[PDB]
Symmetry: C2
């Protein structure tokens, strides 16, 4: 498919690498550092490599108008949700320390210029840009100036609109990933459009490609791996009974493990070429391919035809089924027994 | 991807249709009609649509040489295995009746001219050609002359060698499917090469494409569906404790159900285009996209710049983040409050 790659800290990502699953804790902690640690514990214990946060600074993120608009997966204003769920700077730094104390990589999504500057102070190794900000070219400009790789979600945006984001990113000189995304919580299977991934890699041949997902299970992400996806993002919770607008579409430890196992299998199985000769098939070819045999007794001096020849397993005959018709007209050099393989010495 | 389609009895197959899972009972019954019925029962009860048999007539299938060659997944000769497992004509007809008495479609793979003629007498609705016979052009010629659709496995064969089979098939005028296949029992993930499927559809634009699989689980088949596969073939047993060389890589009722559910999800999610506008995302765009706001108090008559402007959620401002730079140089038509959205009436 391609050889694009970059590193997130010590983790290589790309088509030739192991798919990377991002455990998006997001606002799932509902503003409680204690709940956030219980979720980081759950991710570590499940074998997680990366925990992603969301960095919400409500005042720099939203004008007063946001106190009057309700998201699709809630019944109160987006401002109220973020005020309730937002971790302040001190707590978020505690979160990063904790994630790295568990040997995992901490990254986050900034929703504001100020959140972007807070993450730079923390020196995070890579930046996620959510689909809501994929057309926020001033924010992308700022983040790209930090000099770290960017993982850009591309939901709600056209290839044309994404080109503008990618130009900014290329200008800064940082490697980037494009995640295909549908921003409905949860997302119906029929809206996922995994082909969107090929559209993206075709439009932007230097991007690492993956999927951010909000369906109820792992199937979309597994198909993304089969298609060449290198990064998989789902929401993550320690248990499904938690409250929160994103919980519904989250992995838990069990389904994270399933996805990790499925992704590993599909990383190995995907790609390659039809014509590749697999040494392991050799014993099968030898017994299963057919060879040319006499279909009747043939007297010395008789002509071989489609009437006294046929083809039978196994494949070790002097003449393969591929040469069947080349024996028509040959002269029987001796008596040929019905059912015997045609030998080179059976014809003049 | 494409609109190729044909019918197997009353079942449409093709990219625009529900993926079809073929429950390959094969030689799993070990020659016992009783065991074969217990497996047909298990398939029906799991929701199976198709049961595939193998039609073995040892004498027309193999010359005496087959009594000296051992398959990869056994330790006795291929002739011994088939002698032990082969159902005679009377029993195989009982098998077909039974499968159809359960409302399922019966098809089979012939390994010989005589088996092909036996299946024509039974008037089966479609023919499977196993990879061992994909280069048996005389057998393909015979089967194609029956006038039913053909599902051709293509393991162990090059695109070039398959062209010869497909030419024969086109000549007869029957629609066909090509199943990508690796004939190692079981098959390692790393040998599956799901890309082989795209190679096939590219070489043969009129073929229905699918996967015949011999890995230990469902992941290969799920990736095949994400790639556009229309037919999925695995071996099938009622329970994993049975004896037989193909049991190891078979579905049972539980894993058949998982694959059926995964295939349905991936049929809905696959394909499509990145730029498609999903009505369900509309509430997210409205709250998540940014609008241009004042970044400081701006006095009437002052110029708007990148220094007194910024962008914040939500998206209902007079000026979107896409028009941010078009406001530079505009003249403040009144005093503008820090944090207020820029209104059309705020500029001269
Ligand atoms: C549109 C948006 O901002 N959606 C984020 C989500 O948590 C929502 O805030 C909750 O649904 C609020 O109800 C998240 O999906 C964005 C993202 N990538 O798309 C990232 O966090 O990188
Ligand atoms: C090479 C071959 O003949 N393989 C068949 C398999 O059952 C073997 O007989 C057992 O492994 C014997 O040990 C089967 O895979 C072929 C097929 N499509 O490939 C079909 O039946 O249509």
């Amino acid at each position: 498919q391609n050889n694009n790659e970059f590193k997130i800290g010590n983790r290589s990502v790309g088509y030739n690498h192991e798919p990377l699953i991002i455990c998006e804790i997001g606002i799932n902690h509902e503003g409680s550092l204690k709940t956030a640690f219980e979720m980081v514990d759950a991710a570590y214990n499940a074998g997680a490599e990366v925990v992603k946060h969301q960095t919400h600074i409500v005042e720099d993120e939203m004008s007063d108008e946001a106190k009057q608009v309700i998201p699709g997966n809630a019944d109160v204003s987006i401002y109220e949700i973020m005020e309730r769920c937002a971790l302040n700077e001190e707590d978020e730094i505690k979160l990063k320390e904790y994630v790295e104390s568990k040997g995992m990589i901490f990254i986050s999504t900034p929703f504001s210029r100020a959140a972007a500057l807070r993450l730079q102070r923390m020196d995070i190794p890579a930046y996620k840009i959510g689909s809501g900000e994929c057309n926020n070219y001033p924010l992308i400009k700022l983040v790209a100036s930090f000099g770290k790789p960017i993982i850009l979600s591309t939901g709600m945006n056209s290839i044309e609109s994404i080109k503008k984001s990618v130009e900014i990113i290329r200008e800064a000189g940082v490697p980037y990933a494009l995640l295909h995304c549908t921003n409905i919580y949860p997302t119906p299977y029929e809206d996922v459009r995994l082909g969107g991934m090929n559209d993206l890699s075709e439009a932007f041949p230097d991007a690492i490609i993956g999927l951010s997902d909000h369906t109820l299970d792992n199937y979309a992400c597994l198909g993304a791996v089969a298609l060449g996806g290198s990064i998989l993002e789902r929401h993550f919770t320690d248990r499904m009974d938690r409250p929160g607008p994103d919980i519904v579409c989250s992995m838990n430890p069990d389904t994270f493990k399933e996805l990790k196992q499925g992704a590993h299998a599909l990383k190995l199985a995907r790609g390659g070429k039809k014509d590749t000769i697999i040494a392991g098939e050799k014993p099968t070819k030898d017994f299963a391919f057919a060879s040319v045999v006499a279909d009747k007794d043939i007297k010395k001096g008789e002509l071989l035809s489609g009437d006294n020849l046929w083809v039978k397993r196994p494949g070790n005959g002097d003449f393969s089924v591929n040469e069947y018709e080349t024996l028509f007209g040959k002269v029987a050099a001796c008596n040929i027994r019905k059912g015997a393989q045609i030998k080179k010495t059976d014809i003049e």
